[PDB]
Design a binder for this molecule. Structure first.
Ligand SMILES: [Zn+2]
Ligand SMILES: [Zn+2]
Ligand SMILES: [Zn+2]
Ligand SMILES: [Zn+2]
Ligand SMILES: [Zn+2]
Ligand SMILES: [Zn+2]
Lengths: 326, 327
């Protein structure tokens, strides 16, 4: 069974899953301290519900919010929006790239306990339990990031809950992360190497896939083509077309690794951790939001000749095998 | 009228005030996400209530908790402890040394609006309003720190609430902050240069006091060495005696600046922003806690010939004048 913000669900209920999304990209405590940054908490809720409903209609039944403590994860916000939109939402524990001092001063043993509290007992005082662990690195894994990766591994081994990662920028850190995970004894089938669509290095992708890693092709709609004049847009969404990103799905299918692919939008409905009004920039690029995958991508892959059954297998079977604890 | 976590109080109700303290030194959202780091929320409350009742029995009537959003300020915690201990607590807005991305990506205009929200409307959804603005800088003022200093000057000018600031990683350094504040039109009488007891340079402090700045001699008990083993307790506390620090109070009095002096402990009852069990190290060197000032420093200055009325001016009159919103 899989933990959601509304409680436990069966594999069968999971359905069509977007495994890499956010309701809001922020910082710990920020939404509670300055809700007016988003207009109001009430507007943010309405926008998230009006978006999750358009995706639900397009077939989406589950999303995984990979927002950690330090990404401003507000679990009560997740519950409100999930219940209102009637779409499953899996919450995360772990540590992203903006840990405050109270997190970054902690040991591997302490960080392990923290992830365990959030998976086994609940997030804050809510009883809502994390379904996944999200970690991140920059360039070469820093000493602190190594502690986080090791703690994430130990937590996964204790609870069966999977791990999702990424490396800042377009850097290909999967091999370095994979090395640390395996030194802890973690099975690659419990790990997704995320943001893998930031690169066109197919040898890199296939090799990880061949080892059993899930390949997170999850920023498909991100593209600053047309926004060349907006330097902050480029740094965030890149210069590669969404088509180029989506073709990596085909390419990996064509190598026989369909069972290892996870597809998503890495979207959200508010963001405060970047430049002001960046949400409006993203919205002007991908008006379909979280519906971009079921609506505009699936047909694309359908057109290029991928069998419907293979897609269903990627959008339903894969997420379920991934999310289901072991 | 001065805002506290229990509502507005009149100037006469403030009494003996510790102008630079914390209930807990943490990170935003952390106490709510990992209360077990402190044993439990319930354990932290009990420890803080006992600590504040001790201070109160030593004469303390108000403290100023200078904890910002990014220092993990929890105003519901402050309200609970204030009520239980019957000690007034003034809450803070501002930015300390650990802003998350959602803060450090903001413009001067945005930070001003944030501080104003916390002073004029309330903190989070509690209706509790900040009565002071806390800012911090390092070495040479960073571009972002300059933004914070200016936003703080602007919020002060709009509300009359005072500003407390300090320089981490160096003694001196108040001149930078003074230049920036004054460039914005802020009266020095609205500004306390905190952690000033960390310097021995008396000419530097007197010069600031003569410009009208308030001098925060507010880490007196952090002198503590004893523990040569820890490169974390002599790099976070020091190597001088608390007496040498307290003598700076006498020294500024003797120069005729008694009205410009604020005195405090910079204590707390939990801390998560440094090494695990740093609280135990702190408690071992100063078991008096926030009572350190009234139990050790006051008697010490008394024995040095400082009269009652001067001591009361420093601990009662100065803080009331400082905190009373003045435009
Ligand atoms: Zn990421
Ligand atoms: Zn992502
Ligand atoms: Zn993401
Ligand atoms: Zn300080
Ligand atoms: Zn201080
Ligand atoms: Zn302090």
């Amino acid at each position: 069974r899989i933990n959601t913000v509304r409680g436990p669900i069966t594999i069968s209920e999971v359905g069509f899953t977007l495994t890499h999304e956010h309701i809001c990209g922020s910082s710990a405590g920020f939404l509670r301290a300055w809700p007016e940054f988003f207009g109001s908490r009430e507007a943010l809720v309405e926008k998230a519900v009006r978006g999750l409903r358009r995706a639900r209609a397009a077939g989406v039944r589950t999303i995984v919010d990979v927002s950690t403590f330090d990404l401003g994860r507000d679990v009560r916000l997740l519950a409100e929006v999930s219940r209102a939109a009637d779409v499953h939402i899996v919450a995360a524990t772990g540590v992203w790239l903006d840990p405050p001092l109270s997190i970054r001063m902690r040991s591997v043993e302490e960080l392990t306990q923290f992830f365990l509290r959030e998976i086994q007992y609940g997030i804050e005082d809510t009883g809502i339990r994390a379904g996944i662990i999200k970690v991140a690195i920059t360039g070469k894994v820093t000493p602190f990031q190594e502690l986080v990766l090791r703690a994430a591994a130990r937590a996964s081994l204790a609870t069966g809950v999977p791990v999702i990662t990424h490396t800042a920028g377009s850097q290909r850190g999967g091999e370095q992360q994979a090395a640390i995970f395996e030194s802890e004894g973690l099975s690659p089938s419990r790990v997704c190497i995320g943001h893998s669509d930031e690169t066109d290095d197919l040898s890199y992708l296939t090799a990880l896939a061949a080892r059993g890693y899930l390949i997170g092709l999850d920023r498909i709609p991100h593209s600053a083509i047309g926004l060349e004049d907006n330097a902050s847009a480029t740094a965030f969404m890149g210069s590669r077309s969404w088509q180029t990103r989506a073709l990596l799905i085909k390419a990996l299918i064509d190598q026989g690794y369909m069972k290892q692919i996870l597809v998503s939008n890495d979207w959200l409905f508010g963001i405060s951790s970047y430049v002001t009004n960046f949400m409006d920039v993203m919205d002007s690029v991908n008006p379909d939001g979280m519906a971009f995958i079921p609506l505009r991508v699936i047909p694309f892959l359908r057109e290029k000749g991928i069998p419907q059954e293979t897609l269903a297998g990627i959008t339903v079977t894969n997420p379920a095998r991934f999310l289901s604890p072991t």
